[PDB]
Protein backbone atom coordinates (compact mmCIF):
# COMPACT_ATOMS: atom_id res chain seq x y z
CA UNK A 1 0.00 0.00 0.00
CA UNK A 2 2.77 2.04 1.20
CA UNK A 3 4.95 0.99 -1.54
CA UNK A 4 2.41 2.12 -4.11
CA UNK A 5 1.36 5.02 -1.95
CA UNK A 6 3.04 7.41 -4.16
CA UNK A 7 2.07 6.64 -7.82
CA UNK A 8 4.14 3.56 -8.21
CA UNK A 9 0.97 2.06 -9.51
CA UNK A 10 -1.17 5.15 -9.96
CA UNK A 11 -3.46 2.15 -9.91
CA UNK A 12 -3.96 2.36 -6.24
CA UNK A 13 -6.71 4.92 -6.49
CA UNK A 14 -9.32 2.70 -8.15
CA UNK A 15 -8.95 -0.01 -5.78
CA UNK A 16 -9.99 1.85 -2.74
CA UNK A 17 -13.19 2.63 -4.37
CA UNK A 18 -14.22 -0.94 -4.38
CA UNK A 19 -11.74 -3.31 -5.91
CA UNK A 20 -10.06 -3.26 -2.64
CA UNK A 21 -13.16 -2.47 -0.70
CA UNK A 22 -13.17 -0.47 2.60
CA UNK A 23 -15.82 0.18 5.21
CA UNK A 24 -13.55 -1.06 7.99
CA UNK A 25 -13.66 -2.62 11.40
CA UNK A 26 -13.17 -0.40 14.39
CA UNK A 27 -9.50 -0.35 15.61
CA UNK A 28 -8.47 -1.11 12.06
CA UNK A 29 -9.90 2.09 10.93
CA UNK A 30 -7.77 4.26 13.18
CA UNK A 31 -4.65 2.82 11.63
CA UNK A 32 -5.69 4.00 8.13
CA UNK A 33 -5.32 7.72 8.76
CA UNK A 34 -1.64 8.24 7.67
CA UNK A 35 -1.85 6.85 4.18
CA UNK A 36 -4.93 8.85 3.36
CA UNK A 37 -3.18 11.75 4.85
CA UNK A 38 -0.39 11.45 2.32
CA UNK A 39 -2.73 11.74 -0.65
CA UNK A 40 -4.87 14.22 1.08
CA UNK A 41 -1.79 16.18 1.60
CA UNK A 42 -0.24 15.76 -1.78
CA UNK A 43 -3.21 17.03 -3.73
CA UNK A 44 -1.53 16.11 -6.97
CA UNK A 45 -1.59 13.44 -9.69
CA UNK A 46 -4.85 12.79 -11.35
CA UNK A 47 -4.37 9.38 -9.85
CA UNK A 48 -3.80 11.24 -6.56
CA UNK A 49 -6.88 13.43 -6.69
CA UNK A 50 -9.19 10.49 -7.10
CA UNK A 51 -7.36 8.61 -4.48
CA UNK A 52 -7.95 11.38 -2.03
CA UNK A 53 -11.63 11.17 -2.45
CA UNK A 54 -11.95 7.41 -2.19
CA UNK A 55 -9.58 6.86 0.67
CA UNK A 56 -10.89 9.49 2.75
CA UNK A 57 -14.38 8.34 2.10
CA UNK A 58 -13.91 4.67 2.64
CA UNK A 59 -12.00 5.06 5.79
CA UNK A 60 -14.42 7.90 6.64
CA UNK A 61 -13.43 11.11 8.53
CA UNK A 62 -13.73 13.20 11.68
CA UNK A 63 -15.62 16.38 11.47
CA UNK A 64 -12.70 18.46 12.33
CA UNK A 65 -10.33 17.50 9.69
CA UNK A 66 -13.04 18.29 7.18
CA UNK A 67 -12.80 21.79 8.17
CA UNK A 68 -9.15 22.03 7.25
CA UNK A 69 -9.95 20.31 4.06
CA UNK A 70 -12.83 22.65 3.15
CA UNK A 71 -10.31 25.43 2.79
CA UNK A 72 -7.94 23.16 0.93
CA UNK A 73 -10.73 22.24 -1.32
CA UNK A 74 -11.56 25.81 -1.72
CA UNK A 75 -8.62 26.32 -3.77
CA UNK A 76 -8.31 22.88 -5.07
CA UNK A 77 -11.42 21.92 -6.68
CA UNK A 78 -11.53 24.09 -9.76
CA UNK A 79 -8.70 22.63 -11.64
CA UNK A 80 -5.97 20.95 -9.72
CA UNK A 81 -5.81 18.06 -12.15
CA UNK A 82 -9.31 19.12 -12.97
CA UNK A 83 -10.45 18.30 -9.52
CA UNK A 84 -14.07 19.09 -10.24
CA UNK A 85 -14.87 15.84 -11.92
CA UNK A 86 -13.29 13.64 -9.22
CA UNK A 87 -14.91 15.81 -6.80
CA UNK A 88 -18.35 15.44 -8.41
CA UNK A 89 -17.88 11.77 -8.02
CA UNK A 90 -16.67 12.37 -4.54
CA UNK A 91 -19.65 14.61 -4.07
CA UNK A 92 -22.01 12.04 -5.33
CA UNK A 93 -20.59 9.86 -2.63
CA UNK A 94 -21.03 12.74 -0.09
CA UNK A 95 -24.67 13.13 -0.96
CA UNK A 96 -25.01 9.42 -0.38
CA UNK A 97 -23.23 9.11 3.00
CA UNK A 98 -25.14 12.09 4.04
CA UNK A 99 -27.99 12.85 1.71
CA UNK A 100 -29.63 15.48 3.87
CA UNK A 101 -28.80 13.36 6.96
CA UNK A 102 -26.05 14.47 9.29
CA UNK A 103 -27.92 17.61 8.28
CA UNK A 104 -25.57 19.75 10.26
CA UNK A 105 -22.96 18.48 7.89
CA UNK A 106 -25.39 18.76 5.15
CA UNK A 107 -25.82 22.37 5.94
CA UNK A 108 -22.15 22.97 6.58
CA UNK A 109 -21.60 21.32 3.33
CA UNK A 110 -24.41 23.23 1.83
CA UNK A 111 -22.98 26.51 2.79
CA UNK A 112 -19.68 25.39 1.58
CA UNK A 113 -21.01 23.83 -1.54
CA UNK A 114 -22.62 26.92 -2.75
CA UNK A 115 -19.71 28.89 -1.52
CA UNK A 116 -16.74 27.05 -2.99
CA UNK A 117 -18.97 26.80 -5.88
CA UNK A 118 -17.69 27.98 -9.18
CA UNK A 119 -20.98 27.04 -10.48
CA UNK A 120 -20.31 23.38 -10.61
CA UNK A 121 -22.36 22.60 -7.67
CA UNK A 122 -25.49 22.61 -9.81
CA UNK A 123 -24.70 19.26 -11.31
CA UNK A 124 -23.97 18.04 -7.88
CA UNK A 125 -27.29 19.44 -6.75
CA UNK A 126 -29.03 17.19 -9.10
CA UNK A 127 -27.58 14.39 -7.07
CA UNK A 128 -27.81 16.07 -3.69
CA UNK A 129 -31.46 16.87 -3.79
CA UNK A 130 -32.03 13.39 -4.96
CA UNK A 131 -30.18 12.07 -1.91
CA UNK A 132 -32.20 14.15 0.49
CA UNK A 133 -35.39 12.74 -0.99
CA UNK A 134 -34.00 9.22 -0.79
CA UNK A 135 -33.75 9.53 2.93
CA UNK A 136 -36.93 11.49 2.81
CA UNK A 137 -35.02 13.79 5.17
CA UNK A 138 -36.59 15.10 8.31
CA UNK A 139 -34.36 18.02 9.34
CA UNK A 140 -36.04 19.52 6.40
CA UNK A 141 -37.08 22.51 8.31
CA UNK A 142 -33.47 23.44 8.48
CA UNK A 143 -32.45 21.57 5.36
CA UNK A 144 -35.09 23.32 3.37
CA UNK A 145 -34.29 26.40 5.24
CA UNK A 146 -30.75 26.43 3.81
CA UNK A 147 -31.96 25.34 0.41
CA UNK A 148 -34.60 27.91 0.18
CA UNK A 149 -32.47 30.68 1.24
CA UNK A 150 -29.43 29.93 -0.60
CA UNK A 151 -31.02 28.90 -3.74
CA UNK A 152 -32.40 32.28 -3.49
CA UNK A 153 -29.00 33.83 -4.12
CA UNK A 154 -27.47 30.73 -5.57
CA UNK A 155 -29.84 31.06 -8.52
CA UNK A 156 -30.36 28.78 -11.59
CA UNK A 157 -33.83 28.44 -12.73
CA UNK A 158 -33.24 24.88 -13.78
CA UNK A 159 -32.81 23.59 -10.25
CA UNK A 160 -36.01 25.16 -9.33
CA UNK A 161 -37.77 23.08 -11.89
CA UNK A 162 -36.66 19.92 -10.41
CA UNK A 163 -37.13 20.82 -6.85
CA UNK A 164 -40.48 22.34 -7.60
CA UNK A 165 -41.72 19.20 -9.02
CA UNK A 166 -40.70 17.31 -5.86
CA UNK A 167 -41.90 19.89 -3.50
CA UNK A 168 -45.06 19.81 -5.47
CA UNK A 169 -45.88 16.51 -4.09
CA UNK A 170 -44.70 16.98 -0.56
CA UNK A 171 -46.43 19.92 1.08
CA UNK A 172 -48.45 19.57 4.39
CA UNK A 173 -47.19 16.21 5.43
CA UNK A 174 -44.30 18.34 6.60
CA UNK A 175 -45.96 21.31 8.15
CA UNK A 176 -44.36 24.63 9.19
CA UNK A 177 -46.94 26.46 7.23
CA UNK A 178 -46.09 30.08 7.67
CA UNK A 179 -42.57 29.54 6.71
CA UNK A 180 -43.34 27.36 3.89
CA UNK A 181 -45.82 29.94 2.59
CA UNK A 182 -43.33 32.51 3.34
CA UNK A 183 -40.98 30.76 1.03
CA UNK A 184 -43.43 30.06 -1.54
CA UNK A 185 -44.35 33.53 -2.03
CA UNK A 186 -40.78 34.35 -2.59
CA UNK A 187 -40.30 31.75 -5.16
CA UNK A 188 -43.00 33.18 -7.12
CA UNK A 189 -41.64 36.67 -6.38
CA UNK A 190 -39.22 36.19 -9.14
CA UNK A 191 -40.32 37.06 -12.52
CA UNK A 192 -41.05 34.50 -14.99
CA UNK A 193 -44.49 33.61 -15.55
CA UNK A 194 -42.87 30.32 -15.37
CA UNK A 195 -41.24 30.79 -11.94
CA UNK A 196 -44.37 32.10 -10.63
CA UNK A 197 -46.33 29.21 -12.02
CA UNK A 198 -44.62 26.46 -10.05
CA UNK A 199 -45.74 27.74 -6.68
CA UNK A 200 -49.30 27.30 -7.81
CA UNK A 201 -48.76 23.83 -9.23
CA UNK A 202 -46.92 22.46 -6.18
CA UNK A 203 -49.68 23.85 -4.21
CA UNK A 204 -52.30 21.61 -5.71
CA UNK A 205 -51.18 18.58 -3.81
CA UNK A 206 -50.70 20.81 -0.88
CA UNK A 207 -53.86 22.81 -0.95
CA UNK A 208 -55.88 19.81 -1.27
CA UNK A 209 -54.34 18.41 1.83
CA UNK A 210 -54.28 21.64 3.75
CA UNK A 211 -52.23 21.90 6.89
CA UNK A 212 -52.11 23.28 10.51
CA UNK A 213 -54.39 26.13 9.42
CA UNK A 214 -55.03 25.89 5.68
CA UNK A 215 -58.45 25.08 4.23
CA UNK A 216 -60.33 28.30 5.03
CA UNK A 217 -57.57 30.43 4.22
CA UNK A 218 -56.56 28.24 1.32
CA UNK A 219 -59.77 29.33 -0.09
CA UNK A 220 -59.02 32.95 0.85
CA UNK A 221 -55.50 33.05 -0.66
CA UNK A 222 -56.04 32.38 -4.32
CA UNK A 223 -58.20 35.42 -4.13
CA UNK A 224 -55.65 37.52 -2.32
CA UNK A 225 -52.94 36.79 -4.74
CA UNK A 226 -54.04 37.32 -8.35
CA UNK A 227 -52.41 38.41 -11.66
CA UNK A 228 -52.82 39.89 -15.03
CA UNK A 229 -50.25 39.93 -17.73
CA UNK A 230 -52.50 38.16 -20.11
CA UNK A 231 -51.30 34.70 -20.30
CA UNK A 232 -49.91 35.24 -16.94
CA UNK A 233 -53.35 36.82 -16.42
CA UNK A 234 -54.79 33.77 -17.87
CA UNK A 235 -52.82 31.54 -15.63
CA UNK A 236 -54.42 33.18 -12.61
CA UNK A 237 -57.77 33.33 -14.29
CA UNK A 238 -57.67 29.85 -15.62
CA UNK A 239 -56.54 28.18 -12.50
CA UNK A 240 -59.31 30.05 -11.04
CA UNK A 241 -61.45 29.25 -13.96
CA UNK A 242 -60.61 25.65 -13.54
CA UNK A 243 -61.29 26.14 -9.93
CA UNK A 244 -64.45 27.90 -10.99
CA UNK A 245 -65.30 24.90 -13.04
CA UNK A 246 -65.09 22.08 -10.22
CA UNK A 247 -66.41 21.83 -6.61
CA UNK A 248 -63.14 22.56 -5.22
CA UNK A 249 -63.12 19.47 -3.21
CA UNK A 250 -63.84 17.37 -6.24
CA UNK A 251 -61.55 19.56 -8.19
CA UNK A 252 -58.71 18.69 -6.03
CA UNK A 253 -59.39 15.02 -6.29
CA UNK A 254 -59.41 14.69 -10.05
CA UNK A 255 -56.59 17.05 -10.82
CA UNK A 256 -54.24 15.85 -8.14
CA UNK A 257 -54.29 12.53 -9.72
Amino acid sequence: QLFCSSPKAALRYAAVRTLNKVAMKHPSAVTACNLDLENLVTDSNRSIATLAITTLLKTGSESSIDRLMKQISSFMSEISDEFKVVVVQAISALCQKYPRKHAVLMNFLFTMLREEGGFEYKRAIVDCIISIIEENSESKETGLSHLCEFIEDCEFTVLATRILHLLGQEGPKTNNPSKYIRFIYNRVVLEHEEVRAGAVSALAKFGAQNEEMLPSILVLLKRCVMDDDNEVRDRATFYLNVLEQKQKALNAGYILN
Binding site: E152, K179, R182, Y185, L190, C224
Partner: protein, 230 residues
Protein backbone atom coordinates in the same frame (compact mmCIF):
# COMPACT_ATOMS: atom_id res chain seq x y z
CA UNK B 1 -10.90 72.10 32.81
CA UNK B 2 -12.63 75.32 33.72
CA UNK B 3 -12.55 75.67 30.09
CA UNK B 4 -14.81 72.87 29.37
CA UNK B 5 -15.85 72.50 25.90
CA UNK B 6 -18.71 70.37 25.14
CA UNK B 7 -19.76 69.77 21.74
CA UNK B 8 -21.99 67.73 19.70
CA UNK B 9 -23.03 67.69 16.13
CA UNK B 10 -26.24 68.99 14.83
CA UNK B 11 -26.96 68.34 11.28
CA UNK B 12 -29.33 70.66 10.32
CA UNK B 13 -30.48 70.44 6.91
CA UNK B 14 -27.67 69.15 4.73
CA UNK B 15 -25.36 70.93 6.77
CA UNK B 16 -23.73 69.18 9.29
CA UNK B 17 -22.89 71.78 11.55
CA UNK B 18 -20.83 71.69 14.56
CA UNK B 19 -22.20 72.95 17.81
CA UNK B 20 -19.23 73.67 19.98
CA UNK B 21 -19.29 75.00 23.23
CA UNK B 22 -15.96 75.82 24.20
CA UNK B 23 -16.57 77.29 27.38
CA UNK B 24 -13.59 78.81 28.74
CA UNK B 25 -14.25 78.93 32.22
CA UNK B 26 -10.63 79.51 32.08
CA UNK B 27 -9.11 82.17 34.11
CA UNK B 28 -8.45 84.05 30.86
CA UNK B 29 -8.79 84.12 27.02
CA UNK B 30 -6.21 81.47 27.61
CA UNK B 31 -4.15 81.01 24.48
CA UNK B 32 -5.47 78.55 21.98
CA UNK B 33 -4.08 76.15 19.77
CA UNK B 34 -4.57 75.19 16.31
CA UNK B 35 -7.07 73.84 13.95
CA UNK B 36 -6.71 72.53 10.32
CA UNK B 37 -9.06 72.60 7.13
CA UNK B 38 -9.61 69.73 4.80
CA UNK B 39 -11.34 68.24 1.94
CA UNK B 40 -13.82 66.03 3.22
CA UNK B 41 -16.22 63.60 1.56
CA UNK B 42 -19.04 65.05 -0.45
CA UNK B 43 -18.63 67.78 2.09
CA UNK B 44 -15.66 69.69 3.10
CA UNK B 45 -15.28 71.31 6.42
CA UNK B 46 -15.25 74.76 5.90
CA UNK B 47 -15.40 77.18 8.84
CA UNK B 48 -13.52 78.15 11.96
CA UNK B 49 -14.37 81.16 14.14
CA UNK B 50 -10.95 82.85 13.96
CA UNK B 51 -9.76 83.84 17.46
CA UNK B 52 -7.77 81.76 19.85
CA UNK B 53 -8.45 83.17 23.34
CA UNK B 54 -10.23 81.17 25.93
CA UNK B 55 -11.74 84.17 27.46
CA UNK B 56 -12.01 83.94 31.17
CA UNK B 57 -15.01 82.14 32.90
CA UNK B 58 -16.63 82.71 29.57
CA UNK B 59 -18.67 80.58 27.32
CA UNK B 60 -18.40 80.41 23.50
CA UNK B 61 -20.12 79.05 20.58
CA UNK B 62 -17.95 77.93 18.00
CA UNK B 63 -19.53 77.00 14.90
CA UNK B 64 -18.29 74.85 12.25
CA UNK B 65 -20.10 74.74 9.13
CA UNK B 66 -19.19 71.93 7.10
CA UNK B 67 -19.75 71.97 3.43
CA UNK B 68 -22.25 69.25 2.63
CA UNK B 69 -22.09 68.41 -1.02
CA UNK B 70 -18.38 68.21 -1.55
CA UNK B 71 -14.79 67.25 -0.72
CA UNK B 72 -14.40 63.66 -1.51
CA UNK B 73 -12.62 61.79 1.00
CA UNK B 74 -13.38 58.15 0.60
CA UNK B 75 -12.84 57.31 4.28
CA UNK B 76 -16.08 55.51 4.48
CA UNK B 77 -18.66 55.92 7.11
CA UNK B 78 -16.62 58.95 7.75
CA UNK B 79 -14.58 57.94 10.64
CA UNK B 80 -11.76 59.94 9.82
CA UNK B 81 -9.35 61.51 12.09
CA UNK B 82 -9.84 65.02 12.97
CA UNK B 83 -7.82 67.51 14.77
CA UNK B 84 -8.17 70.01 17.53
CA UNK B 85 -4.68 70.72 18.58
CA UNK B 86 -2.66 71.31 21.60
CA UNK B 87 -1.00 74.26 20.01
CA UNK B 88 -1.47 77.04 22.55
CA UNK B 89 -2.68 77.04 26.12
CA UNK B 90 -2.99 73.49 25.50
CA UNK B 91 -0.23 70.95 25.68
CA UNK B 92 -2.60 68.32 24.11
CA UNK B 93 -6.20 68.44 22.89
CA UNK B 94 -8.39 66.08 21.02
CA UNK B 95 -7.59 64.17 18.02
CA UNK B 96 -10.50 62.27 17.16
CA UNK B 97 -11.77 60.13 14.45
CA UNK B 98 -15.44 60.21 13.99
CA UNK B 99 -17.75 57.55 14.32
CA UNK B 100 -21.34 58.64 14.37
CA UNK B 101 -21.72 58.95 10.69
CA UNK B 102 -24.25 56.62 9.26
CA UNK B 103 -26.48 55.90 6.34
CA UNK B 104 -30.11 55.28 7.28
CA UNK B 105 -30.87 58.88 6.93
CA UNK B 106 -29.01 59.72 3.71
CA UNK B 107 -30.96 57.92 1.26
CA UNK B 108 -34.23 59.14 0.15
CA UNK B 109 -37.01 56.97 -1.27
CA UNK B 110 -37.09 56.36 -4.91
CA UNK B 111 -39.32 54.46 -7.30
CA UNK B 112 -39.82 51.84 -10.47
CA UNK B 113 -42.05 49.74 -13.03
CA UNK B 114 -42.40 46.46 -11.56
CA UNK B 115 -41.76 44.12 -14.37
CA UNK B 116 -38.66 45.93 -15.22
CA UNK B 117 -38.05 46.17 -11.63
CA UNK B 118 -38.01 42.46 -11.13
CA UNK B 119 -35.78 42.10 -13.99
CA UNK B 120 -33.70 44.72 -12.53
CA UNK B 121 -33.85 43.41 -9.05
CA UNK B 122 -32.21 40.34 -10.17
CA UNK B 123 -29.97 42.31 -12.35
CA UNK B 124 -28.56 44.63 -9.72
CA UNK B 125 -25.48 44.30 -7.44
CA UNK B 126 -26.76 41.23 -5.80
CA UNK B 127 -24.04 41.07 -3.37
CA UNK B 128 -25.50 41.87 0.10
CA UNK B 129 -28.31 40.66 2.25
CA UNK B 130 -29.12 40.75 5.98
CA UNK B 131 -32.02 39.11 7.76
CA UNK B 132 -34.97 40.29 9.29
CA UNK B 133 -36.17 38.36 12.05
CA UNK B 134 -37.00 39.78 15.49
CA UNK B 135 -38.53 43.04 17.02
CA UNK B 136 -41.11 44.59 19.38
CA UNK B 137 -44.02 45.39 17.00
CA UNK B 138 -46.00 44.43 13.87
CA UNK B 139 -44.47 45.42 10.60
CA UNK B 140 -47.36 47.78 10.16
CA UNK B 141 -46.15 50.17 12.81
CA UNK B 142 -42.71 48.59 12.65
CA UNK B 143 -42.48 48.91 8.88
CA UNK B 144 -43.69 52.49 8.99
CA UNK B 145 -41.15 53.30 11.68
CA UNK B 146 -38.28 51.74 9.75
CA UNK B 147 -39.41 53.43 6.55
CA UNK B 148 -39.50 56.85 8.17
CA UNK B 149 -36.20 56.24 9.93
CA UNK B 150 -34.29 55.53 6.74
CA UNK B 151 -36.42 57.93 4.75
CA UNK B 152 -36.72 55.31 2.06
CA UNK B 153 -39.29 53.67 -0.35
CA UNK B 154 -41.20 50.42 -0.51
CA UNK B 155 -42.36 50.60 -4.11
CA UNK B 156 -45.72 48.85 -4.39
CA UNK B 157 -48.44 46.77 -2.68
CA UNK B 158 -50.53 43.89 -3.94
CA UNK B 159 -53.39 43.42 -1.67
CA UNK B 160 -52.50 40.02 -0.33
CA UNK B 161 -52.75 41.64 2.55
CA UNK B 162 -50.36 42.74 5.31
CA UNK B 163 -53.10 41.95 7.72
CA UNK B 164 -54.57 38.40 7.81
CA UNK B 165 -50.91 37.49 7.68
CA UNK B 166 -49.84 38.86 4.99
CA UNK B 167 -47.36 36.52 3.30
CA UNK B 168 -46.10 39.62 1.53
CA UNK B 169 -42.55 40.40 0.14
CA UNK B 170 -42.00 44.08 -0.03
CA UNK B 171 -39.99 45.76 -2.49
CA UNK B 172 -38.11 48.73 -1.59
CA UNK B 173 -36.14 51.28 -3.44
CA UNK B 174 -34.34 54.43 -2.49
CA UNK B 175 -32.02 57.03 -4.02
CA UNK B 176 -29.48 59.13 -2.03
CA UNK B 177 -27.80 62.51 -1.89
CA UNK B 178 -24.79 61.39 -3.77
CA UNK B 179 -27.05 59.31 -5.94
CA UNK B 180 -26.70 55.54 -5.32
CA UNK B 181 -29.90 53.66 -5.96
CA UNK B 182 -30.39 50.74 -3.58
CA UNK B 183 -32.79 47.82 -4.16
CA UNK B 184 -34.55 45.48 -1.74
CA UNK B 185 -36.71 42.59 -1.64
CA UNK B 186 -37.27 41.54 1.72
CA UNK B 187 -39.69 38.66 2.10
CA UNK B 188 -41.37 38.61 5.65
CA UNK B 189 -43.79 36.45 7.87
CA UNK B 190 -45.98 39.27 9.65
CA UNK B 191 -47.72 39.33 13.19
CA UNK B 192 -51.22 37.98 13.90
CA UNK B 193 -52.27 35.77 16.85
CA UNK B 194 -51.50 32.07 16.21
CA UNK B 195 -50.74 32.88 12.49
CA UNK B 196 -47.52 34.31 11.62
CA UNK B 197 -45.11 37.15 12.68
CA UNK B 198 -43.36 38.43 15.86
CA UNK B 199 -39.96 37.64 14.37
CA UNK B 200 -39.66 37.31 10.76
CA UNK B 201 -37.15 35.10 9.46
CA UNK B 202 -37.54 37.20 6.39
CA UNK B 203 -34.57 37.90 4.54
CA UNK B 204 -33.54 41.25 3.72
CA UNK B 205 -31.80 41.28 0.46
CA UNK B 206 -29.69 44.29 0.02
CA UNK B 207 -28.16 45.41 -3.17
CA UNK B 208 -25.78 48.32 -3.12
CA UNK B 209 -22.91 48.59 -5.43
CA UNK B 210 -20.09 48.06 -3.10
CA UNK B 211 -20.77 45.19 -1.01
CA UNK B 212 -19.03 46.95 1.72
CA UNK B 213 -21.42 49.72 1.98
CA UNK B 214 -24.22 47.52 0.90
CA UNK B 215 -24.02 44.94 3.53
CA UNK B 216 -23.20 47.61 5.92
CA UNK B 217 -26.42 49.13 4.91
CA UNK B 218 -28.13 45.85 5.69
CA UNK B 219 -26.62 46.14 9.06
CA UNK B 220 -27.46 49.72 9.36
CA UNK B 221 -30.92 48.93 8.75
CA UNK B 222 -30.48 46.12 11.15
CA UNK B 223 -29.65 48.72 13.70
CA UNK B 224 -32.57 50.66 12.50
CA UNK B 225 -34.84 47.69 12.68
CA UNK B 226 -35.39 47.59 16.30
CA UNK B 227 -35.58 49.97 19.07
CA UNK B 228 -33.14 49.40 22.07
CA UNK B 229 -30.05 50.94 24.15
CA UNK B 230 -27.54 52.24 21.69
Amino acid sequence: DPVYAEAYVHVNQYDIVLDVLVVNQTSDTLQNCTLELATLGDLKLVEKPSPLTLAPHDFANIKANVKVASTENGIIFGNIVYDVSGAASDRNCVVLSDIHIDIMDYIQPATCTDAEFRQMWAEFEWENKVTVNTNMTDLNDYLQHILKSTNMKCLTPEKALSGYCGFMAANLYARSIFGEDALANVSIEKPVHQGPDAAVTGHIRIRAKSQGMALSLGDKINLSQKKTSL
